[PDB]
Each structure stands twice: as structure tokens, then as C-alpha cells.
Amino acid sequence: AAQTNAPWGLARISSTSPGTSTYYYDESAGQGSCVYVIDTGIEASHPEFEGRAQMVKTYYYSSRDGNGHGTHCAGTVGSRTYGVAKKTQLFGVKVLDDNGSGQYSTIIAGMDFVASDKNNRNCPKGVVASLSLGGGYSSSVNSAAARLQSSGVMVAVAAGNNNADARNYSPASEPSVCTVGASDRYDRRSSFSNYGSVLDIFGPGTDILSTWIGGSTRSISGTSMATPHVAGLAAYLMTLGKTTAASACRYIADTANKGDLSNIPFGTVNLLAYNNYQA
Ligand SMILES: [Ca+2]
Ligand SMILES: [Ca+2]
Numbered sequence: 001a002a003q004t005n006a007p008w009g010l011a012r013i014s015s016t017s018p019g020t021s022t023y024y025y026d027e028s029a030g031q032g033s034c035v036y037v038i039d040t041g042i043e044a045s046h047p048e049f050e051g052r053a054q055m056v057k058t059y060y061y062s063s064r065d066g067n068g069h070g071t072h073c074a075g076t077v078g079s080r081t082y083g084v085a086k087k088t089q090l091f092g093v094k095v096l097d098d099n100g101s102g103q104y105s106t107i108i109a110g111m112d113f114v115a116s117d118k119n120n121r122n123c124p125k126g127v128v129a130s131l132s133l134g135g136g137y138s139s140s141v142n143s144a145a146a147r148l149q150s151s152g153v154m155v156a157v158a159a160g161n162n163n164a165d166a167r168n169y170s171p172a173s174e175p176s177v178c179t180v181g182a183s184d185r186y187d188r189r190s191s192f193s194n195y196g197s198v199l200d201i202f203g204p205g206t207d208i209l210s211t212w213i214g215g216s217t218r219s220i221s222g223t224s225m226a227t228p229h230v231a232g233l234a235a236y237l238m239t240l241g242k243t244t245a246a247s248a249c250r251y252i253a254d255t256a257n258k259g260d261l262s263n264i265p266f267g268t269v270n271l272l273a274y275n276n277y278q279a
């Protein structure tokens with residue numbers, strides 16, 4: 001399949017070179033997989049989700065996304081127009097309030113919830129968890145992400161928007177999960193993106209058009225936008241039988257475009273997510 005005039009981030013992960021505008025992908029489109037979006041919630045009624053999204057857990061008064069951050073990330077995962085895996089199943093877990101904030105104890109509970117809730121869902125091709133959140137270092141938050149990964153879920157987390165070493169931020173500094181950095185459309189490291197030896201992969205993170213609350217769309221930037229690119233790609237690759245949850249991050253790194261990015265500090269990988277699609 002080929003989506004013309006696609007968002008630049010989708011066209012980037014299906015090309016060996018920047019500047020293209022078509023997103024080439026296999027028609028399976030992550031069908032059979034499930035992706036948990038642990039964020040501010042999802043506007044599941046958005047037409048771009050085609051009824052493939054639903055809220056399963058909230059830690060606040062309502063399950064509605066009163067912010068838009070979680071709806072935007074879910075749209076990059078698997079919306080019809082702006083998603084990597086356009087046929088995947090989307091589950092929303094609201095651990096952040098409508099201001100985009102949340103206590104670590106609630107974030108830890110949301111991860112432990114996903115590790116158990118996946119056992120009563122029908123996801124034959126695999127389960128993915130996308131965490132576009134983070135803060136200061138916490139060994140309890142890192143351990144919760146490691147538990148979720150060990151239970152059999154592909155965990156993708158954002159590296160942070162501090163332009164610093166991600167080793168001082170959680171759950172980005174957990175080695176067992178897949179930490180995602182951000183890049184722009186000219187194959188430059190996003191000026192805000194964190195770095196360090198803990199980063200596994202980079203994704204499109206600057207000026208990312210996706211869904212928004214109120215049935216709308218908008219473009220924002222952050223490593224919170226690059227993470228759903230890797231999460232959606234994982235669900236896309238697992239549906240193809242190429243990899244599994246325990247080794248998706250390593251497979252994505254092994255098959256990535258190497259050496260394409262600029263302004264990458266020494267000690268940080270120069271790897272850009274890529275689906276290796278061939279018609
Ligand atoms: Ca290249
Ligand atoms: Ca890692």
C-alpha cells in the first residue's frame with residue numbers, strides 16, 4: 001500500500017532518504033496487534049480511529065481526554081490518516097490529568113495494570129505499550145517499566161525534551177525498554193531531544209501532524225511524538241511475524257537507517273526507525 005501526501009514522519013520511516021512524501025506499508029497494517037497508550041486518554045469517538053480505540057482504565061474522575069496529548073499520540077500509533085499501524089487496536093489508560101501531569105505512584109499503577117489487563121484481551125499478534133511521559137530519575141518507575149517489559153509487552157518510552165543525557169530521567173533511563181529520541185524532517189536531531197548511551201533508536205518528533213480533541217488535528221513537537229512512531233512500527237512488524245515483544249527494539253535497531261542523522265553526540269546511536277518495506 002502507498003499513502004500519498006502523507007505526514008513527513010510516516011514517509012520518513014518507509015524511506016532510506018529524507019524528503020519523500022509517500023508512506024509505503026504492507027496492507028496488514030498491524031491488524032491483530034494491540035497498543036496500550038498510557039497518557040491523558042484518547043478521544044475514542046474521533047472518526048480517524050474508525051472505532052478501533054477504546055478507554056479501559058482511568059485514575060481520575062473521567063476517562064475523557066481533556067488535554068489532547070494522549071489523543072495525538074494514539075493518532076500517530078494507529079489513526080487512519082496519521083497512524084503507522086492503521087489497523088491496530090488502541091487501548092487508552094489515563095494516568096495523566098487534563099493538565100498533562102501525574103504522580104509517579106499513579107504512573108506505576110497504570111503500568112502494572114497493563115501487564116495484567118493484556119491477559120483478558122484478544123491480541124494474537126502481540127501487545128505494545130507507548131509511554132510519552134517522564135520526569136526525574138526514579139528507581140521505582142524504572143522497575144515498573146522493566147516489569148511491564150518482562151511480562152511480554154513491547155515498551156517504548158520517550159527520552160525527554162531536556163537536551164540532556166537521558167540517564168537522569170525515568171522511565172527513559174531503564175535499559176530493558178526501548179528509549180526513543182526525536183529527529184526533524186532534515187535528518188537533524190531535534191533541538192530539544194535528549195541523548196546518551198541509553199537511547200536505543202530515533203524517530204520523527206518535530207512538527208508531527210496527528211489527531212486532537214474535538215474531532216480536530218494539529219501539529220506539535222516532542223519526543224512524545226517520536227515514541228508512537230516506534231510503538232506503531234513495532235505492532236506493524238509483529239503482525240508480519242518479523243519479531244516479538246522481547247526483541248522488537250533490537251530488531252528495529254538492527255534494521256534501521258544508520259548514520260543518517262546529524263548533530264548526534266558521540267556515544268549516542270545514529271539509528272533512525274525504518275520499516276524496510278519492499279513492494
Ligand atoms: Ca540514508
Ligand atoms: Ca534499551
